[PDB]
Every structure is written in C-alpha cells, then in structure tokens.
Design a protein around this ligand. Structure first.
Ligand SMILES: Nc1ncnc2c1ncn2[C@@H]1O[C@H](COP(=O)(O)OP(=O)(O)O)[C@@H](O)[C@H]1O
Ligand SMILES: Nc1ncnc2c1ncn2[C@@H]1O[C@H](COP(=O)(O)OP(=O)(O)O)[C@@H](O)[C@H]1O
Ligand code: BEF
Ligand code: BEF
Ligand SMILES: [Mg+2]
Ligand SMILES: [Mg+2]
Lengths: 457, 456
RNA sequence: GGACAUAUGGCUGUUCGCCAUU
RNA sequence: GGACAUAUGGCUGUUCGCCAUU
C-alpha cells in the first residue's frame, strides 16, 4: 500500500497504479512539493540528484489532465533529447491510471514530417527540447491554448544564457494563467534570482543544499593530459565496473577515449552531439541494458539520465562549471544506491578542483596511481536485438518475451531489458545466446506475424 | 557515339550519358516513337515486353525538363509501387546529363509526413501510384500547374475499370495543354478505343502485335490443383533455375506456395499486397540480387518489373485475363535474352489455356510430368542492409570502396549495390556474408561509422 | 480476384490479443 | 566549450569528398 495516499488528492486509480509500479514510499522532494503542486501553486524545487523529481512534477501535472479534451494541457521542457524521451517514458507509466493519455516527445534528430502527422491528434502532454518545439509552434502544428501546467526540468540549465531566448520564444506561445514548475538539483544564485520571470507567486522549496549529495565516494588523480588514457585503462582494469560513464569536455576527446578503450578490449560506446540521432538512441539503449561496459559522453549525458545501478563515474576532465560536476557524479548513487566517482586533474584543471572542493565542502581524496600497470579487457555481458515495429506495431514486452521463450526456446533468465520505442523494440540477451536468438527470431514469428530482427554491435 | 545521335535532338551531355549507361543502340520502340515524342506529340505505343519502353518515355519527358524551374514538370503513373520506384530508378540514371534534377516517388506504404517534407523542394519529376498522389493533390502538397508531360506506363491497366476513377481525379489537377504518353505491351481494343479521352490528337505507334512476343519458350502441364505444389518442387529441382518467378492468382496461394518451397529447402520469398511495404521492398531487393532463388508473387509483379536475366517463369495458376499472361511471361526474355515459361493447368483452367492459345497464335506444348526427387535450391548471395542511403550521400562507389579496401573483400564477391533513399543494399556471396557484415559493423564507410544489418 | 489504398493513440515481462476517437 | 539546432536535392561500382538553390 503506497504512502502517496496520505496526500488525499490522487484518485484511487492512480493509487492502484502507483502500487503496481512500486512507488510505495514518497521521496523527500515528492513529499515536500506534491501538496503545493496539486493545489495549483508555482514552485521552484531544489533536491539532490536521483531522488525522484520526475514523479514529483509528473504526478502533479497528471492530476490536471482531462483525457476527453483532445488538446495539449501539460508541457515539459528538457535540455537534451535523451532526457526528454526518458521523462516522457516515465510520465507514460505514471499515466496508466488515465486510459488514452497521449504523451508525445518533440525533439530534433526526428524527421519533422512524422511529428506533424502525429500532431493532428493533439497530444495531452508534450515533452520536448526547445528547438524542435519552437519550430512546431511557429508553423502552427502545436497549440498551447489549453495549457494547465508548464514544467522546466533541469530549470537552471533551461534559464541560462544559452537557452533563455529559446525559452522566452516558447513562453510567448503559452498562456499567462498557467502553473509553472521549476525543478533542479543545482540553482546558481544568478539563475535563481531571475527564475521568477517565468512564474506567478512561486513557493521556494529548497530541501537539499547544494553540498547535500547522494552517497558518492570521490577519488582524485593527478595526471598529465598524456597520461589520462593509460590511467583510465588501468583504473577500469582495477575496478572492473559492471557499468561506467566517462565524461569528457569535448566531442573530440569523447570519441578519442572511446576508440582507445575499444582498442584494449574494454567495451565502450560514445555519446555526443556529432553522432547521428539513431546512434545516440541506440548507444543509450545498449549501455543501459548491459550491451556495453563503458559509456564515454560529453555533458549531453551530464543531467537527468537515469541508468539503473550505475557503478562508476569518471571525470576524464573536470567540467567547466562546478554545478555540472554535481550532475555528472549524480549519474551514480540514484534511488537510494551508493556510487563511486573518480576525477582526473591535470595542472591546468587544479583551480576547477578547488572550486568543487569549496562548493561541496568536501576534502579531495587524492589517490596514488595504481601499482599494477596491466591493462585487462572488459567484455559486455549482453547484446542488443533490434526488432522492427515498436509501439506502432503494438508489440509489447510480453510479446517479445513470449516469442523468445517459446518456439525459439530460450530461458527467461537469458533475456534482460526490453525497451519499446515508437518504431522499434530493443531486447537484451546474453552474449553467448545472442546470435542464435537473432537467427531463430528472424525466421520465426512474433505475435503471430513475421518480424525483422537486427543484431546491434 | 550511340545511334541516339541520329535523332538530332538530344543534348550532347545526354549522348555521353547514354554511352556510359550502355545504351549504344536504339531499341525498336525507342527508334520508332522517340522522334514524335521529342517533337511534343501525344503517342499511344504498343511494343513487346522488355524492349525498352521506359527509356522511350524517359528520354522523351527529360527533353522538356527545365532544371532552373523548381516546379513539377513531368508526371509518370504506374500501377504498382515497386514498378513506380523502378521507373524512377532508371529516370535518375537517364537524368545524369542534367545536374540537380530531383525525381521523387510518391507511393503508399511510405509515411505521408516524410513525403510532405520532401515536397517543399518541389521535384521536377514525380513517379507515383495513383492513390498516394491523389492524396497529395487533394491536400495541396503537389501542384501540376507547370506540368509539361504526363506518362501512363502500363497504360491499359491504368485505364481499366479499377483505375479509371482515380486517373480521372488526378487528371483534374493536370493542365489540358500537356504532352500525354501512353505505353503498354497489351491494348484491349475496348481500352484502346477510350484511351483518347486523356490525349490530344495522338499518334498510334503499334509496332508489335499482341502475339509478337520476345523469344519465350512455353510449356504446359496438366495437373490437379492438389498436384501443383509437388510438381512445382520437382520442376524446380529438375531445372535448377538461377532465378524464377512463380505467379499465383490469390494472396493466400502465393504465401502457401512460398512456405511449401521453403519447407523443401528451395530458397523462396513472397511478394503480395498483404505484406508490409518494407517486406515488399526488401523481398524484391533480395530476389533481384540473388539472395533468393524463387520469387512467389501475385500479379503485383506481373507488369514492368525488370529483373536481370530471369531464367524461368512458372504460372502456378493461369491468369484470369490473357493479357496478364503476356505480362507474366514477359518477366523473362528481356533486353534481347531468351527465357522459359512453364504453366500449370487444372481442368477448370483449360478454358484459359485455349484463350491464350488463340491470342498468342501458338500451339500449346503439353509436357509429361517428370519421371523424380525433390532437391534443394541454395541462394548464392546474401543481402547486407546499410543505414543511410541517399540521405547520407552514399554512392555505390563508397560501399564498394569500403568493402574492398579497409574491410578487405574481393571485388568479385560483391554483387548488386542498390542505393535507396534511406538505405543501401549490397549483395555478397553467402560464404563471406557473415564476415562482411561483422567487419563492416565495426568498420567505417566514407570516413563515418555505419550500422549494418544482414537480412537473411 | 489482383492492384491502388488503409488516421492517431492507450493496455499485464512467457507472444498469436483487448480498447479509445482525433 | 557542451547543449539546443543543423532545409531539399544532384554527382561515372575500389569509400574518407565535390556541387546546386528551395
Ligand atoms: N517514490 C519512489 N519510489 C521508488 N522509486 C522511485 C520513486 N520516485 C522515483 N523513483 C525512481 O528513482 C529514480 C529517480 O529518478 P529521477 O526522478 O530522474 O531522479 P531526479 O530527477 O531527482 O534525478 C527513477 O528511476 C525513478 O523511477
Ligand atoms: N537502348 C538500349 N540499349 C540497351 N539496353 C536497354 C536499352 N533500352 C533499355 N534497355 C534495358 O533493357 C531493359 C528493358 O526494360 P524496360 O524499359 O522496362 O522494358 P519495357 O518497359 O519495354 O518492358 C531494361 O533493363 C533497360 O535498362
Ligand atoms: F537530478 Be536527477 F538525476 F534528474
Ligand atoms: F513491357 Be515491359 F516489361 F515494362
Ligand atoms: Mg530528473
Ligand atoms: Mg515498362
């Protein structure tokens, strides 16, 4: 029985949904912010990473959704496409209590035409990045006239110098009589002081100070820039993390580190803005489901990404801003878990390490370099099958699991994460059984119908 | 220089284009119909199958294309989606003489929004099936206001009872002052009499009578309906055709025969209207490049499809109309080749065999069934599907360059390369297919990384 | 018969389905 | 720096590019 019932607002169908979903206890940010949000107040919330802010504003805006009114009623803004799809994915699971709730994602990298076609049936909720959404607004394919709530996730990033104009351009399409929710784990005083420009009489709910991190152990290594890649390979050999995210400050360094890790057999993929959007999506799928051991990324992955039970974060180079460092290490130690965050520091980056030390009021644990120089390989335990169809073909996870376990004859313990995307379904299978599964499912049948299956790298 | 120079009309760049393409001699329909078309006249043409009608109307409409004018100036209508894409494929090859010529296909099975997106830059030429084109016309995403030429390939099918309404609906968007070209190998007089409704004082160029077939040998077998599938398996085991098209009259029989052929190990794919369009496209790709030995199809493949050096056509059931029989067997013996067409005849279908006998002025060569065991038919190739296509600026040379250079493949192990709008299909011999797929998966084409799937 | 065509979404992790109207 | 964004096409089967204006 869920503790969310103590709010005395949510309908019984939502309480049953939360019980089936496993939301049995409210996190602090949920307990502190949901009553005000459900009452229609504007809020600015500050809570640490991985503490459930998504459901905090998601349960809030869902309470004011009328499924019979086929117009857009809630809008969520995110700084990155992968985060936007993730937030929309969790909103959909929270919206199960309300049948026929259409939640649409509007991001770049997708062709404009398919979004225009989907927008003829106006979605109740839009989760979007500012760029593609503004395009749709200017061409009259999206209307905000029926907007009840506007949410800005990672709101200090959405209000910075880079996003302010695009955010301002979007808000002129929004009604003034709206609930505006701003959520983030970090709030620079400059950004927080001006944050009222997009709100009406907001309540400040600052339950975690900026130095109140999740349980993250931090280690720091002195190294020249030239020694970073050899050090990283040796540290990954020492810790042997089940999953690891390595952060770089440039797209060039990001791809270079990924290629260096794959050259020594340490299963790595890259995630940055010069990749094709399909590769960005498939890389995140394969890293999350265990088809890759290490993810090398720029700050496109610094915020909000919720990779389950991430063991290790490595700062190949310290971020330009200390707030970004907080978001990076926040990729681990989520939802009550602990984590380890290693940071490399060249002499030019010493001052950024000092700024992080002051802001977080932590003592840097400088480590002595490893005793062994041996570089071991890291093989990924899973491989990803990509089946054509997705939600358009009404292929649900039970169909994939049923087909894989039946005539194709696989053990249910050999199948990991199943992710249903709009046009594809991704399945994780143990590496040893992946090739047989691919060939047998290619000439088999799923849901009575024939399928097209790909085996990803 | 190519004999096309004797037309004294084509620009020099097109004469060079024809020589590089291998069009060194004009076919009869090209030699007989192109002067009138290049002079701007409406024509109704009757020429046998596989004798070059596409270039006949393709060179015609391209002569009146203004590349600086970014409006639709030529429209080609086809009865099937695969034929429309095929006709556009050869039009692009013929349009190399004119840089920056946009030829777009408008067919069903493709998402509407992506087509709307492409239509912001209006294409010079549209090749389309009537259904999806009319949708675009009614929604104002396509304009025929600047149309110079209108082509109806397989014009006798486009003017029949099933298409008449939609064709009229399309023509309502076209100018009356237009060149209208009608091509087909078959012309029922009833359809030919009403064909003038869409033309302006047309020239009739009927160089092949309906019985003037390409060199196609025909054999006929008496058989029960129950004995058809075992006979087919035995005939394919005897003949071992490198490629074969088996025609059925229903979508159910089409899939049933395909599955029975695969049960005895005779590499077969199916092509019919109940398939997803992606399956239809990939089936035609894999059959055309040798990744399957037998193609089982309904009459969706009866007309216009140009499969190179197709060895055998089998009529599992005789078509309802004799003209469709002409188009079916016309899938073989193309562009000067010979071919074999076997037909099965159940007692209920004897009447259809006689009608074919009269129309084609042939005496039926009835065969006695094979003395015979059922053998396997292995596909010699496998198809790699690379993501990108023309959207990613991938030209066939890039794929071949990556396969032969870094990945280290023999150039003689790579067959047909087909650049589609979003994908590139490559045929490689099955013995090397898995190695090619895996190494191209972790390799790079054109400097950039690729994501490669193996269809099989 | 065969073509042409066939909107947009919601729904249990052992499939072959069940719903909504835009 | 990193996000957001990044139109539509043409180019001769041994790639890593070259062009057009919408
Ligand atoms: N009340 C809850 N009970 C159990 N799990 C939760 C609860 N709220 C959130 N979670 C899960 O914990 C993780 C926290 O994710 P997220 O909301 O992205 O944190 P934040 O946005 O604050 O960084 C998510 O995987 C979410 O599904
Ligand atoms: N003048 C020519 N010289 C050589 N080959 C040609 C010539 N014209 C056409 N071809 C080829 O011959 C085949 C005839 O195809 P197609 O035009 O579809 O015939 P039809 O439309 O008359 O059935 C095609 O593969 C085409 O590329
Ligand atoms: F702060 Be959470 F990681 F969005
Ligand atoms: F008449 Be051809 F086969 F198009
Ligand atoms: Mg979040
Ligand atoms: Mg033709």
């Amino acid at each position: 029985m869920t503790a969310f019932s103590t709010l005395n607002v949510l309908p019984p169908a939502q309480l049953t949904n939360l019980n089936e979903l496993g939301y049995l206890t409210m996190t602090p940010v949920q307990a502190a912010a949901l009553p005000a949000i459900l009452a229609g107040k504007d809020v600015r919330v500050q809570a640490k990473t991985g503490s459930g802010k998504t459901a905090a504003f998601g349960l809030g805006l869902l309470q004011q959704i009328d499924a019979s009114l086929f117009q857009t009623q809630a809008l969520v803004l995110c700084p990155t496409r992968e985060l936007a799809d993730q937030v929309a994915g969790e909103l959909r699971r929270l919206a199960r209590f309300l049948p026929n709730t259409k939640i649409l994602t509007l991001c770049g990298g997708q062709p404009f035409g398919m979004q225009r076609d989907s927008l003829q049936h106006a979605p109740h909720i839009i989760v979007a990045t500012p760029g593609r959404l503004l395009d749709h607004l200017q061409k009259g394919t999206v209307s905000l006239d029926a907007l009840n709530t506007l949410v800005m996730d990672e709101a200090d990033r959405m209000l910075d110098m880079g996003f302010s104009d695009a955010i301002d351009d979007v808000i002129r399409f929004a009604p003034a009589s709206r609930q505006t929710l701003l959520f983030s784990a970090t709030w620079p005083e400059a950004i927080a002081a001006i944050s009222g420009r997009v709100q009406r009489d907001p309540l400040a709910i600052e339950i975690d100070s900026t130095d109140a991190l999740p349980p993250i152990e931090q280690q720091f290594y002195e190294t020249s820039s030239k020694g970073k890649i050899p050090l990283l390979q040796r540290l990954l050999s020492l810790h042997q993390p089940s999953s690891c995210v390595v952060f770089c400050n440039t797209k060039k360094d990001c791809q270079a580190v990924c290629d260096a890790l794959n050259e020594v057999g340490q299963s790595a993929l890259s995630l940055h803005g010069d990749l094709e959007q399909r590769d960005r999506d498939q890389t995140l799928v394969r890293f999350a489901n265990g088809s890759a051991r290490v993810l090398v990324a720029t700050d496109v992955a610094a915020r909000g990404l919720d990779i389950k039970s991430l063991e290790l974060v490595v700062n190949f180079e310290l971020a330009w801003d200390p707030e970004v460092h907080v978001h990076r290490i926040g990729r681990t130690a989520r939802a009550g878990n602990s984590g380890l965050a290693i940071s490399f520091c060249a002499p030019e980056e010493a001052q950024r390490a000092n700024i992080i030390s002051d802001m977080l009021q932590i003592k840097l644990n400088w480590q002595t370099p490893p005793a062994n120089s041996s570089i071991a390989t890291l093989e990924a335990e899973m491989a990803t099958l990509c089946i054509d169809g997705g939600k358009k073909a009404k292929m649900r996870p039970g169909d994939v699991l049923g087909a894989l376990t039946g005539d194709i004859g696989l053990d249910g313990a050999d199948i990991g994460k199943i992710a249903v995307h709009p046009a594809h379904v991704y399945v994780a299978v143990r590496q040893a059984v992946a090739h047989k599964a691919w060939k047998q499912l290619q000439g088999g049948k799923i849901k009575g119908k024939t399928c097209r299956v790909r085996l990803l790298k």
